């Protein structure tokens, strides 16, 4: 979550080049998530200017995806080094947003929420609300285990899954066996005849 300028809303995307995208918040190309934003000119704007919102426009390297940088170090603009003192060719790397209600829409504060869903296979902690059904064994069923959809026959098995292992895979990465998320038991998946 962050609040940016209305001109910077388009920069929150994979493969985007810009001041905020390269120096403040960088998105990976294989981004699996959602980007949500809305206008908040009535909230985050003083009558004389809400200068409490800061952004970085000076950095000598582009950010790597999902990087958090709170460096206060003064940018060495010229050839002469800056030993912690700003001035000529030595600039404070952050800039204050001037949030006035009389500004245009492109220069209005926008409350941006970025959702990112790591889909790495591990015991899962965040699901959606779905009425769970009783499992039926030794029958061709259309199963759904934590969003993994498939058709097959669920039978009792003896494949000792390790406690951190949730899914089993075949040679052609078809789901060979699953651990039930409700009761910690082991089942094969054999596709129907």
């Amino acid at each position: 979550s962050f609040v940016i300028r209305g001109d910077e809303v388009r920069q929150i995307a994979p493969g985007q080049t810009g001041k905020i995208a390269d120096y403040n918040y960088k998105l990976p190309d294989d981004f699996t998530g959602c980007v949500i934003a809305w206008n908040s000119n009535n909230l985050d704007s003083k009558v004389g200017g809400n200068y409490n919102y800061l952004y970085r426009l000076f950095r000598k390297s582009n950010l790597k995806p999902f990087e958090r940088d709170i460096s206060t170090e003064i940018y060495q603009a010229g050839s002469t080094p800056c030993n912690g003192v700003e001035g000529f060719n030595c600039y404070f790397p952050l800039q204050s947003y001037g949030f006035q209600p009389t500004n245009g829409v492109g220069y209005q504060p926008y409350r941006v929420v970025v959702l990112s869903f790591e889909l790495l296979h591990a015991p899962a902690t965040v699901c959606g609300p779905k009425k769970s059904t009783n499992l039926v064994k030794n029958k061709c069923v259309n199963f759904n285990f934590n969003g993994l959809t498939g058709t097959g026959v669920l039978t009792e098995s003896n494949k000792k899954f390790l406690p951190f292992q949730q899914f089993g895979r075949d040679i052609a990465d078809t789901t060979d066996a699953v651990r039930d998320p409700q009761t910690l038991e082991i089942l094969d998946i054999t596709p129907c005849s």
Binding site: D170, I171, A172, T174, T190, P191
Partner: peptide
Amino acid sequence: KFNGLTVLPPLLTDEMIAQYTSALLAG
């Protein structure tokens, strides 16, 4: 395996191949 990849059995079984070789050898 289970991705639609099946093996069809031969028309002539190994017993019939043995019978053919036996007939040829005896002849």
